[PDB]
Amino acid sequence: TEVTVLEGKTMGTFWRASIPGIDAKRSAELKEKIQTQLDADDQLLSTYKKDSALMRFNDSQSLSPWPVSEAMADIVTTSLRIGAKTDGAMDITVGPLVNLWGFGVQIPSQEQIDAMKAKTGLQHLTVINQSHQQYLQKDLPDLYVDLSTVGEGYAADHLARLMEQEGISRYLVSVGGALNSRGMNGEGLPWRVAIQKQAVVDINGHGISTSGSYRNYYELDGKRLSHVIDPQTGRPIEHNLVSVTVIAPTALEADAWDTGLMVLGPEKAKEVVRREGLAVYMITKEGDSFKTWMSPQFKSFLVSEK
Amino acid sequence: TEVTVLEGKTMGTFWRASIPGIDAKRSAELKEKIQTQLDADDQLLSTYKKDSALMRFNDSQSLSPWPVSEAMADIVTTSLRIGAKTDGAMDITVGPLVNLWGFGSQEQIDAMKAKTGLQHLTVINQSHQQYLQKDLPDLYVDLSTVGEGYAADHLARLMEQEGISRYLVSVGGALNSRGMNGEGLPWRVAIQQAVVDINGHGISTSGSYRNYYELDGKRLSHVIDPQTGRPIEHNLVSVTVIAPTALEADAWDTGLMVLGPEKAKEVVRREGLAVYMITKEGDSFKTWMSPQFKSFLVSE
Amino acid sequence: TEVTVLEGKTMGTFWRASIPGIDAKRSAELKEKIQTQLDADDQLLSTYKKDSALMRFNDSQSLSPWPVSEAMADIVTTSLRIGAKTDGAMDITVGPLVNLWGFGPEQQPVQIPSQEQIDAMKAKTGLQHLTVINQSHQQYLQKDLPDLYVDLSTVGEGYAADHLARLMEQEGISRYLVSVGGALNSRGMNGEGLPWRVAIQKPTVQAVVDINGHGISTSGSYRNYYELDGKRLSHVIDPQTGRPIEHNLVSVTVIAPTALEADAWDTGLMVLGPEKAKEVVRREGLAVYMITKEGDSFKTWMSPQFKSFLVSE
Amino acid sequence: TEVTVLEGKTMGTFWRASIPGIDAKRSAELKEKIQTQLDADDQLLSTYKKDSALMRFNDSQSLSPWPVSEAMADIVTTSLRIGAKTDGAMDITVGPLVNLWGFGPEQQPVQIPSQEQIDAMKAKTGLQHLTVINQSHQQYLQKDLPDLYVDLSTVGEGYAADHLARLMEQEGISRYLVSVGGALNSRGMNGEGLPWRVAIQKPTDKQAVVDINGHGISTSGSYRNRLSHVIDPQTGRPIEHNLVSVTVIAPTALEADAWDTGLMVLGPEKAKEVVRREGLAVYMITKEGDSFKTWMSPQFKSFLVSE
Ligand SMILES: [Ca+2]
Ligand SMILES: [Ca+2]
Ligand SMILES: [Ca+2]
Ligand SMILES: [Ca+2]
């Protein structure tokens, strides 16, 4: 009935873990184990750690097979495909363009943007899988891969795997915006998952991840300048889709989809969500108010009651 | 709330789907969509169809990248990875060795073994396409030991695309489930009288008490060890695996069955797998559960 | 156990379908199906859209057979019959007359009372001017007066509700309570084996009726709107008198084999008035409930056939 | 609680009315009213009575509109439409082809198998020859062929059952199970507050329950397994498929009785195409060799009893 909560820092954000029925000691051990695992995940994906596995790939100039871990190969493989399923809205090679703008301290880019698009593109990345090893291969020397739009999802899922190892079957795990829910909370009820305005959903056995455009676009005046850049135009998105929440089997998928959908905007997002049978929640600032939209698949998660 | 159940046949076996109460009309639609997908999956990897994706590849003598669906690449990728973590016990290239046994041979079987080997396959994943690639023309891939596992995971995702997030789906010896029952209770999945809650996971089982045999210490088995070309001979009667996906469960499943009690337990501990085994000692059987597996057990 | 209620707007009014518990996706697919069908009926009948099948016929001047759909033929067919059974009270061709008082919907209340040009207008009116022709693969409407104007607004809600129900059946749902405007249709029991709730206007325990296998429709409300000049002033116009009804009838509810029929009967019964209405009710042995305002009080009245539909639970 | 059961003869078959809480006096009066009404319907549609309304029309040679009742109008209209929707399988003008074989129940036949002369006979049949005209106080039937012969027996039973339903309403009776031949309409609860029991018998050679509260049902078959006496109005000869029984549930007994005969004629495959498209609730029984196989549509399933 008692719910122990563990929290800490990771990947420039925060992680949480709610585990029912744990003693002070095992709680201690688990925090140690959790922090250590996320630390290693940070060391894997972090773009700020010039020494991370990812940055080491980014720094190299090789065009031949580059050994990486199974996780890394899986993270990239799913990132590429969902990138392709979002007409390219979800691009893990868009870093150069985001840097040109100085988003996520600048001078609007003249026409360096066109020339910068040439050093971006999903089709430049390849994942090779073999029995005893996996590899990332780029056909562009200065291709730059950033995975901060999916790292939180991956971390949340990996965190689920840690619970299994530690023989824990009931838990509320989250890293930043991504969460995985399983089992009943303190009381014999599903963990409460509040989506942004606090409508609640029950994702027991599923994962969730939110994503949006907040740059003075979320309840603000002086309406101007979006920091989400469409990897197709090389420029700021213009539509009014401010928030996208996705529920899926894994938090990694949830995390890959929401970014891409966010980028595409309302119209296109809906076309993709319908075609893929995804459970999505959308907030758009049309009038001075915020209107919502929920695909059918997303409603079945709503907590019908109180 | 009610509880609807849909079933049929596919891949030379049976498929089932348990969904919270639904109406007859929607049942017929979901049933048709399910059967069509499973049919699609079978047309993809069945070795009995001369025109399945897998067979066209098997028939190709090309050593250059052969394009395949995302599913194909993913099934292969897991097979090769779990194939290594099990000392090659779980081999998807063993086909030419199993064939020369008529089960499911002179020491000349080393000939078929030559055209065998997990290191002969590579999977290439790109944004808009995937490819399989073999460095041996003769290489022959077979995914029967893993098909049900995938099919089951794929069915659960179809249910997901259909707005059904609460379910218990199964294909052959594999099951997949996420969500509670009509009541906020776990879908009852009984082990070979213990039950487990596999919410968010998959589960596969190999062999049964009705698939173990007599005549001396000789354990009669159809299961052929890839690193031998000959039938296994240990005392592992059955093995059940709970994993993140039924596809992985199905993979570890046959891998562990090939290895046997002792060797398998080694992997189970190393890989931290959720496993349940039954072995034959005297005239009785013993049960062994990894700690990880014990955590999924559900009483009341 | 639990009921799924879908809702929307159509024909300038509200529609509602109370169905037994359904998923989310399935529920979205249904509403989708329903709205489409309802939009299609609106485009079929609406006198408000100049592109509708009805308005096109009205705009035509030919006297030969004009091809229409099964629904059109059927709707006109039972409006002519119920029309004659009410002695012209239910007249789908009374349009030219109404347009003379600037009454009805919202013809911008500025049309003073007419003179006796209503006389020269009723000559553009007449149930005898319409014929319906049914064949195996096609149907037709036929008028013998070029300027005949057919208005199906008093019977449209009833047809929509019945068509909505036949759509529920096509979708495998045989238990439901469906409504469009003031017309309701139902058949099959609740999730609890009980009758779907259908309340009746309580002038001052409210009456409840089980309309299983039938359709129902009401005209008016005890929330009247007449008192100033001449006891009762209405916007409804007697098709045979060319003038606004002046009687005591506050509202009439009719239960019939279909919402369509029920919608035709109550309009015509509302026009006729209390006594004339009762004669036709007795003669056709209809299931009717009436509310009349006597003197600072409302009185209720039920035909024997109507009492038979009452649920005494 | 006590259910009174009334029965009698009509249209060469039998009708039954099960009604709860009714007393001796009322039942006696109802039995009179029912039989009186049925008689009139029989007098309206029978082709076995040379005096009936339908026969007067059949015997005439008129090409101009022929005045009939609303019921006659609606019956024909519904039959003509469902006739078209079943690809002419349900044909109310096929009577002369049937007689050619002498497969009319009241026919020997011991005739002589007709030769392809059946073609010169189909020419005297067809749903496109009939027209229904409705007006304020009148309705007409019009045929563009003298010798056209209309027969409404494959559908008169559904109309009688639905007509019986209206009768029940007139008398203030809300709970009943009323039937005429193989067509029934169910409404309300039985002796115990339970849905009237309606079963679908198996054998159709030579048993499930459904709750059709607020709906109607009719069954059609080809009882008598090798040579069928069901004539395909489009070929002029006996059907060849193995469908032997079709049960249809619909909002009205007329519709149900109209469809089941059409589907029966079409066969399993073509019938299922129709069931699917029209979203009909149907149950079919096919006999391969000596093995009976069944098939229900989704809409039918929802009427299956579950508890
Ligand atoms: Ca993201
Ligand atoms: Ca397996
Ligand atoms: Ca009306
Ligand atoms: Ca029939």
For residues C3-21, b (16+ Cβ closer than 10 Å) or e, as one string? bbebeeebbeeebebbbbb
Burial classification of residue B16, based on how many CB atoms lie within 10 Å of its CB (0-12 exposed, 13-18 middle, 19 or more buried):
middle
Residue identified by tokens 């019964």 is C269
**Beta-strand pair D13-20/D3-10:** antiparallel
Task: Work out the burial of residue A197: count CB atoms within 10 Å of its CB; fewer than 13 is exposed, 13-18 middle, 19 or more buried.
Answer: exposed
Contact A300, A284 (CB under 8 A): no
Contact of A42 with A11, CB cutoff 8 Å? yes
What is d(CA C29, CA B162) in angstroms, rounded to the nearest whole number?
A: 11
CA distance A84 to chain B (A): 6
Asked if D302 and B25 come within 8 Å (Cβ–Cβ), the reply is: yes
Cβ-based contacts of C24 with chain B (< 8 Å): 163
Q: Tell me the CA–centroid distance for residue B85 and ligand 2, in Å.
A: 15
For residues A114-144, b (16+ Cβ closer than 10 Å) or e, as one string?
A: eebbebbbbbbbbbbbbbeebbbbbeeeebb
Please count the other Cβ atoms lying within 10 Å of the Cβ belonging to residue C195.
20
Chain A residues lying within 8 Å of B163, measured CB to CB: 277, 279, 296-297, 299-300
D160, D11 Cβ separation under 8 angstroms:
yes
Q: How many CB atoms lie within 10 A of CB D32?
A: 10
Instruction: Give the D-side interface with B, CB within 8 Å.
Output: 298-299, 301-302, 304
C-beta of residue D284 within 8 angstroms of C-beta of residue D243: yes
Q: Is C281 helix (H, G, I), strand (E, B) or coil?
A: helix
Q: d(Cα D188, Cα C212) in Å, to the nearest integer?
A: 8
* Closest CA relative to residue B294, chosen from B240, B236, B238: B240
Closest CA–CA distance from residue C190 to any residue of chain B (Å): 15
Method: X-ray
How far apart CA B149 and CA B160 sit, in angstroms, is: 17
Q: How far is the CA of A139 from the centre of ligand 3 (A)?
A: 74
Q: What is the dihedral of CA D123, D125, D128, D132, to 10 degrees?
A: 150
C-alpha span between A185 and A188 (Å, rounded): 6
Burial of A49 (0-12, 13-18, 19+ CB in 10 A): middle
Q: Exposure of C275 by Cβ count < 10 A (0-12 exposed, 13-18 middle, 19+ buried)? A: exposed
Distance from CA of B18 to the nearest CA of D (A): 18
Q: Round to whole Å and give the CA distance between D160 and D11.
A: 9
Beta-bridged to residue B133, according to DSSP, are B122
Q: Which tokens sit at C233? A: 């002033």
What 3-state DSSP class applies to D30? Answer: helix
Cβ-Cβ contacts under 8 Å, C23 against chain A:
296, 300
**Residue A257 · residue A82 · CB < 8 Å:** yes
Can you tell me whether residue A4 is helix, strand or coil? strand
Task: Give the integer Cα–Cα distance in Å for C39 and B283.
Answer: 74
Give the DSSP letter of residue C225: -
Q: How distant is the alpha carbon of residue A64 from its chain centre?
A: 28
Residue D232 assigned as binding residue? no
CA-to-CA distance for C158 and C78, rounded, in angstroms? 12
Half-sphere exposure of A53 (CA within 13 A, CB side): 18
The token duo for B61 is 């003598």
Contact C19, C31 (CB under 8 A): no
Q: For residue A86, which ligand has an atom nearest its CA?
A: 1
Q: According to the annotation, is D157 in a ligand binding site?
A: yes
- Residue C125 known to bind ligand: no
Count CB atoms within 10 A of the CB of residue C87.
15
Inter-chain touch C305–D169, beta carbons under 8 Å: yes
DSSP string, C154-211: HHHHHHHHHHHHHHHHHTT---EEEEETTEEEEES--TTSSPPP-B--------BB--
Q: Which residue of B has its CA nearest to D306?
A: B2
HSE-up (13 A, CA, CB side) for residue B12: 9
Show the CA angle centred on residue C260, arms to residues C256 and C262, nearest 5°. 35
Locus of tokens 């002589």: D112
- What CA–CA distances, in Å, run from A66 to A78, A137, A151, B68, B128? 18, 6, 20, 23, 21
**Pairing relation of β-strands A178-182 and A206-212?**
antiparallel
C291 is in an annotated binding site: no
Query: In terms of Cα–Cα distance, which of C148, C162, C285, C278 is closest to C217?
Result: C162
Q: A–D contact (≥3 CB pairs within 8 Å)?
A: no
The CA-based dihedral angle spanning residues B266, B268, B269, B272, taken in that order and rounded to the nearest 10 degrees: 160
C187 chain-D contacts, CB cut-off 8 A: 213-215, 251
- Residues from chain C contacting residue B21 (CB–CB below 8 Å): 21
Which chain B residues touch D301 with a CB distance below 8 Å? 24, 27-28
* Contact yes or no, B with C (3+ CB pairs under 8 Å): yes
- Bridge partners of B16, per DSSP, are B7, B170
| H helical segments located in C60-99 | 70-85, 95-98
Identify which of C159, C158, C197, C190 has the alpha carbon closest to the alpha carbon of residue C175. C190
What are the C-alpha distances in Å from A223 to residues A226, C72, C120, D187, D272?
9, 53, 64, 64, 60
- In whole angstroms, how large is the CA radius of gyration of chain A? 20
Residue type, A17: A
Residue C16 φ/ψ region, left for φ over 0, alpha for ψ in the -120 to 50 degree band, beta for the rest = beta
> Taking an 8 Å Cβ-Cβ cutoff, which residues of chain B contact chain C?
1, 21-26, 162-164
The burial of A224, by beta-carbon neighbours within 10 Å (0-12 exposed, 13-18 middle, 19 or more buried), is given as exposed
- Cα of A85 vs its chain's centroid, Å: 16
Buried b (16+ CB within 10 A) or exposed e, B65-91: bbebeebbbbbbbbbbbbbbbbbbbbb
| CA pair distance A234, A45, nearest whole angstrom | 24
Q: Is C267 annotated as a binding residue?
A: yes
Q: Alpha-carbon dihedral of residues C258, C260, C264, C269, nearest 10 degrees?
A: 30
Render A257-272 in DSSP notation, one character per residue.
HHHHHHHH-HHHHHHH
Both tokens assigned to C6:
């879908």
* Phi, psi (deg, nearest 5) at residue D252: -130, 150
* CB hemisphere CA count around B248 (13 angstroms): 12
Joined together, the tokens standing for residue D256 give 């149900």
Cα atoms in the 13 Å half-sphere on the side-chain side of C304: 10
What tokens appear for B28 in the block? 């017929």
Q: Chain centroid to CA A22: how far?
A: 29
Q: Using CA atoms, how far apart are residues A77 and B107, in angstroms rounded to an integer?
A: 42
Residues of chain C neighbouring D276 (CB-CB closer than 8 A): none
CB contact under 8 A, A129 and B123: yes
Residue C279, class by beta-carbon neighbours within 10 Å (0-12 exposed, 13-18 middle, 19+ buried)? exposed
The nearest CA of chain A is from the CA of B147 a distance in Å of 19
Ligand 2 centroid distance, CA of B136 (Å) = 25
Dihedral sign of CA atoms A107, A109, A112, A113 in order: positive
**C140 neighbourhood in chain D, CB within 8 Å:** none
Residue in chain B closest to A125 (alpha carbons) equals B126
C-beta separation of A97 from A229 below 8 A: yes
Contact B150, B171 (CB under 8 A): no
CA distance A10 to A152: 9
Nearest CA in chain A to C31: A296
Please count the CA atoms within 13 angstroms of the CA of D84 that sit on its side-chain side: 16
Chosen from D135, D166, D305 to mutate, greatest number of chain C CBs within 10 A: D135
Give the residues across from A201 on adjacent strands: A193, A302
Which secondary-structure segment (H or E) carries A253? helix A251-264
Name the closest residue on chain B to residue A248, using Cα atoms. B160
The tokens for D37 are: 């009404």
Bridge partner residues of A245 (DSSP): A210, A281
Contact B198, B298 (CB under 8 A): no
Inter-chain CB proximity D299 and C77 less than 8 Å: no
Task: Report the residue from C24, C25, C172 with minimal CB separation from B23.
Answer: C172
Q: Do you know the residue count of chain A?
A: 306
Residue with tokens 């899922």: A157
Buried b (16+ CB within 10 A) or exposed e, D163-179: bbbebbbbbebbbbbbb
Looking from the CA of B111 toward its CB, the CA atoms found within 13 Å total 7
SS3 of residue C24 by DSSP: coil
CA of C267 to the centre of ligand 3 (A): 4
Separation of alpha carbons B53 and B36, rounded Å: 16
Asked whether D180 and D34 are in contact (CB, 8 A), the reply is: no
Amino acid, res. C223: R
- Chain gaps in chain B, named by the residue before each (C–N > 2.5 Å): 104, 192
Backbone φ and ψ for B201, nearest 5 degrees, come out as: -135, -175
D267: left (phi over 0), alpha (psi -120 to 50) or beta: left
Rounded distance between C-alpha atoms, residue C218 and residue C290, angstroms: 10
Residues of C in Cβ contact (< 8 Å) with B32: none
- Say which ligand is closest to the CA of D247: 4
Residue A164, classed as helix, strand or coil, is: helix
Q: What is the torsional sign of CA A225, A228, A233, A239?
A: negative
Helices (H), chain B: 24-45, 53-59, 70-84, 95-99, 110-114, 144-161, 246-259, 261-271, 291-294
What does B155-218 look like in DSSP terms, one character per residue? Answer: HHHHHHHTT--SEEEEETTEEEEES--SSSS---EE----EE--TTEEEEEE--TTS---STT-
Residues from C contacting B (CB-CB < 8 Å) are: 1, 20-26, 171-173
Convert A282-298 to b/e letters by CB count within 10 Å (16 or more is b).
Answer: bbbbeeeebeebbbbbb
What's the gap in Å between the CA of B49 and the closest CA on chain A? 27
A276 closest CA partner among A25, A134, A90: A90
Place of tokens 């054998």: D203
For A205, which of B125, B127, B200 is closest by C-beta distance? B200
Q: In order of start, what are the domains of chain D with their CATH numbers?
A: 1-307 (3.10.520.10)
Omega cis (within 30) before C96? no
Helices C25-45 + C153-170 axis angle, to 10? 150
C-alpha count within 13 angstroms, C-beta hemisphere, residue B121: 31
Cα gap A224→A126, rounded to integer Å:
37
| Chains adjacent to A (≥3 CB pairs closer than 8 angstroms) | B, C
Neighbours of chain B (3+ CB pairs under 8 A): A, C, D
DSSP A186-198: SSSSBPPEEPP--
Q: Which of B2, B26, B183 to mutate to test the interface with C (most CBs of C within 10 A)?
A: B26
A206 Cα: distance to centroid of ligand 1 (angstroms): 16
In degrees rounded to 5, what are phi and psi of residue B33?
-65, -45
The residue type found at D210 is V
The overall longest dimension of chain D from CA atoms, in Å, is 60
Give me the phi and psi of C222, to 5 degrees please.
-70, 20
Question: Among residues B231, B214, B230, which one has the least CA distance to residue B222?
Answer: B231
- Which among A92, A87, A93, A121 is positioned nearest to A269, based on CA atoms? A87
Q: Could you tell me how many residues make up chain B? A: 300
CA–CA separation, D25 vs D67, rounded Å? Answer: 39
> Two tokens at A190?
């599903």
Q: How far apart are CA D176 and CA B203, in angstroms?
A: 54
Report whether D53 contacts D69 (CB < 8 A): yes
Phi, psi (degrees; rounded to nearest 5) at A68: -145, 170
> How many angstroms separate the CA atoms of A275 and B133, rounded?
31
